[PDB]
Design a protein around this nucleic acid. Structure first.
Length: 183
DNA sequence: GCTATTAAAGGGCA
DNA sequence: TGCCCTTTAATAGC
């Protein structure tokens, strides 16, 4: 399914869910265990669990962001545990509209890349300013994915709402990376 | 750390 | 009305 013989490793998953119930954030922050809340700084209660290792951003609206999981399933599992925590705190928490919002993956092609040559040949998608950031920002349009390409051969792929986008973006770029291998 | 990338949620502010 | 606020994760040159 991966012609290159390389499968990008999923590194981080960001998802959202609607607990469909208003929350008393000050109550949650005082009753909860691994909770942090500073309204002056950000409108969310920051909560963390060990397995799956994640961090949740719980908002008064009942909306919640889960970040840090290594897969979509883990993200949904973590979210459910947070939804359950909130329930045990005395809130009528549901689990409405769970949705994966971003998938970050990375892989190693195992050969150096000539970033400037790559950037020049794909000026429409490439953005490479090494003095500010060492990687070339490749903004692919199909699928709408952003790849950070480093001279080392390591690649970061971000912006996917589905893992097949992550994989496709990688398969698409692979031939380009090969064309621009640093000899 | 910090630079940049991405995505979501919200309060605050020009 | 945009845009930042925070969180996360990979990357690498400051």
């Amino acid at each position: 399914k991966h012609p290159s013989g390389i499968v990008p490793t999923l590194q981080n998953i960001v998802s959202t869910v609607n607990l469909d119930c208003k929350l008393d954030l000050k109550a949650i922050a005082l009753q909860a265990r691994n909770a942090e809340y500073n309204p002056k700084r950000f409108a969310a209660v920051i909560m963390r669990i060990r397995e799956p290792k994640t961090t949740a951003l719980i908002f008064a609206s009942g909306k919640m962001v889960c970040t840090g999981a290594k897969s979509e399933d883990f993200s949904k599992m973590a979210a459910r545990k947070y939804a359950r925590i909130v329930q045990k705190l005395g809130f009528p928490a549901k689990f409405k509209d769970f949705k994966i919002q971003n998938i970050v993956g990375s892989c190693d092609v195992k050969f150096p890349i000539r970033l400037e040559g790559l950037a020049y040949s794909h000026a429409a998608f490439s953005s490479y300013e090494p003095e500010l950031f060492p990687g070339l920002i490749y903004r692919m349009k199909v699928p709408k994915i952003v790849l950070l390409i480093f001279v080392s051969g390591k690649i970061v792929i971000t912006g996917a709402k589905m893992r097949d986008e992550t994989y496709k973006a990688f398969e698409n770029i692979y031939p380009v990376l090969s064309e621009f291998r640093k000899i």
